[PDB]
Design a protein around this ligand. Structure first.
Ligand SMILES: N[C@@H](CC(=O)O)C(=O)O
Ligand code: NA
Ligand code: NA
Ligand code: NA
Length: 417
């Protein structure tokens, strides 16, 4: 029936269509009253979409880090591996720092003041520094998962992944066999969650329509200018990452920047369209071959780099956090800003390569910096940046793929003779 044709039609196009019609309906219903009608009928559809994304946070956070830590563990890291791993972490750290600078320059979301319940967001008291540091170690690992504590879950997931790698290098056959079965079971869980993510994005066009209609009807056209600055900040941030960071690195190691861009045109263009790193990987592997990279070099960095390296996602997270904080009216302190850098890098490592995966991993940063999503004011602000995720997703994927190709160039140059 008609249900079929809705599926094969491109997902990215459907979300874009929902955004346009949702805005127009809100403005038409902006006048003539009927604002209460949108709040009581249209709104519950939007809340269903939000609850689906919140469900996927905890299982992905635990499973992705265990698999990720077991691939970059020092036990199984070779001479080529340690060089490429150091490259990934350093570039990601600089990327989120650049996003913080861009957010301050534009100050997105400052104009809007939202109080859904008639009470503005009240910042919570901050415990002493020693208490915060000691609470990273979970007393009960099972209790952290059940209570939705993010930071304690990060600590347990990483150490569990590293421990399994040492077991797989043991001498006892039974010990090694047990380790592989445990890792496969966790890996199977992680892959299953990404399939659910794809299913949710099919419902996104309906969910985006409800969220935009509610926002435009109440706040008004003032939102359009505010969201415009967010989109401008990210894309201007991304183009600086290509020019300021990648180009100078090529100059230092002697790689021609202009020639590099010409060869990598095919990989960059397809990544923009599909907005998925996994889909771009066969094309990305193909492009490196013409460049003269050794087969062994790009058969390891590119597979690992596709998921481990996501500089564009990290820059997106840094800017998104400031927009939510400014919208609520709160101000991020120096300590919280430093916390963003650490959390954003970890969130990028665990983020999936499927379109729209960045939104789910944004909950990690919000919890860490002291902005819980349970607060209705936060949930309102989280809804707007969620609606425009389709536009920002295209730009993020291009930078992620470009970094992987660039990183291999230096490693191949250095490893060779
Ligand atoms: N589309 C991104 C993931 C994301 O931004 O959620 C990638 O595949 O690298
Ligand atoms: Na990186
Ligand atoms: Na990547
Ligand atoms: Na990742």
């Amino acid at each position: 029936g008609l249900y079929r044709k809705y599926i094969e039609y491109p997902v990215l196009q459907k979300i874009l269509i929902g955004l346009i019609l949702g805005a127009i309906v809100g403005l038409i219903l902006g006048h003539y009253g009927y604002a209460h009608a949108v709040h009581t009928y249209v709104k519950p559809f939007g809340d269903l979409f939000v609850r689906l994304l919140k469900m996927l946070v905890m299982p992905i956070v635990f499973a992705s880090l265990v698999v990720g830590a077991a691939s970059i563990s020092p036990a199984r890291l070779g001479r080529v591996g340690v060089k490429i791993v150091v490259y990934y972490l350093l570039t990601s750290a600089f990327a989120v720092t650049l996003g913080i600078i861009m957010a301050r320059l534009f100050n997105p979301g400052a104009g809007i003041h939202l109080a859904v319940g008639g009470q503005q967001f009240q910042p919570h008291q901050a415990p002493p520094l020693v208490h915060i540091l000691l609470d990273i170690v979970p007393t009960n690992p099972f209790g952290a998962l059940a209570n939705g504590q993010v930071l304690p879950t990060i600590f347990f997931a990483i150490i569990l992944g590293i421990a399994i790698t040492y077991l797989m290098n043991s001498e006892n056959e039974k010990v090694r066999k047990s380790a592989e079965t445990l890792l496969d079971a966790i890996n199977g869980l992680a892959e299953a969650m990404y399939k659910i993510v794809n299913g949710v994005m099919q419902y996104a066009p309906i969910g985006v329509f409800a969220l935009i209609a509610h926002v435009m009807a109440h706040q008004g056209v003032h939102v359009v200018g505010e969201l415009a600055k967010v989109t401008a900040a990210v894309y201007v941030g991304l183009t600086l990452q290509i020019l300021l960071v990648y180009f100078v690195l090529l100059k230092i190691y002697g790689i021609d920047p202009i020639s590099f861009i010409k060869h990598a045109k095919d990989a960059m263009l397809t990544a923009f369209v599909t907005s998925s790193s996994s889909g771009t990987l066969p094309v990305t592997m193909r492009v490196a071959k013409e460049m003269g990279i050794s087969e062994g070099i790009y058969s390891f960095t590119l597979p690992l780099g596709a998921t481990i390296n996501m500089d564009g996602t990290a820059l997106y997270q840094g800017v998104a956090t400031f927009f939510i904080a400014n919208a609520l009216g709160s101000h991020l302190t120096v300590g919280q800003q430093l916390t963003i850098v650490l959390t954003a890098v970890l969130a990028s490592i665990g983020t999936a390569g499927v379109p729209g995966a960045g939104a789910i991993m944004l909950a990690m940063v919000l919890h860490s910096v002291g902005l819980p999503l349970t607060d209705p004011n936060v949930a309102a602000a989280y809804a707007c940046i969620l609606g425009i995720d389709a536009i920002l997703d295209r730009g993020r994927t291009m930078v992620n793929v470009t970094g992987d190709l660039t990183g291999t160039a230096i490693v191949a140059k250095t490893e060779g003779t």
